[PDB]
């Protein structure tokens, strides 16, 4: 269907949000803008459990797991389809830590 990050480094996310249509996976009309670092990104995990799990958006995104605060989405390893994400660099190189799918994928 779609994939909403609603929080990330946003550098590549803005370029990957939308160009012609698709409402940037409804990240503008619904959910939240891909930009982050303004507030706690645990709310991003909450939205992924709420919005991404609502079948509208398949996946999410978090950067480097350092300031991504993705430890709240550590239990999101179960049900991989509602909560699937990989840490890119996007000027913040990925650091392996407790995250949405990082622990499962690494193992």
């Amino acid at each position: 269907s779609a994939l909403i990050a609603m929080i990330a480094d946003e550098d590549t996310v803005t370029g990957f949000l939308l160009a012609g249509v698709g409402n940037v996976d409804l990240r503008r009309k619904t959910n939240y803008l891909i930009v982050d670092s303004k507030t706690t990104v645990k709310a991003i995990e909450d939205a992924f459990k709420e919005f991404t799990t609502k079948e509208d958006i398949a996946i999410v995104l978090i950067s480097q797991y350092v300031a991504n605060m993705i430890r709240f989405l550590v239990d999101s390893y179960n049900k991989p389809i509602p909560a699937i994400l990989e840490i890119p660099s996007k000027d913040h190189p990925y650091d392996p830590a407790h995250d949405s799918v990082l622990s499962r994928v690494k193992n």
């Binding site: 269907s1 550098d11 160009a19 996946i59 991989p80 000027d91 990925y94 499962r104």
Partner: protein
Amino acid sequence: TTKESMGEVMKDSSFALIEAKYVAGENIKHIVLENVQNASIKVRSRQENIAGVKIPKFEYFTDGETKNDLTGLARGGQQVQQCRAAYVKAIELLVELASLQTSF
């Protein structure tokens, strides 16, 4: 293999942002945010029974249905070659991750 492609995907993506800064400077920001020439965020996933177990085929952006493009920006081609390629990699990454978790 997809994880190996990951990280290098972001390294390639950073070049698109550098090109955008060099050519068009600051992005449109706000709702528009510029920097996108292709890879509209629209996907199509379905659970498929493989080896007697349903596996979701998570095809994300740049490999999912209803993907759209709007011409090219000053670095829109670089964004398509870098950011949209990352989306194509991420589609396979999500599909493989879901399949691997279910199979495990």
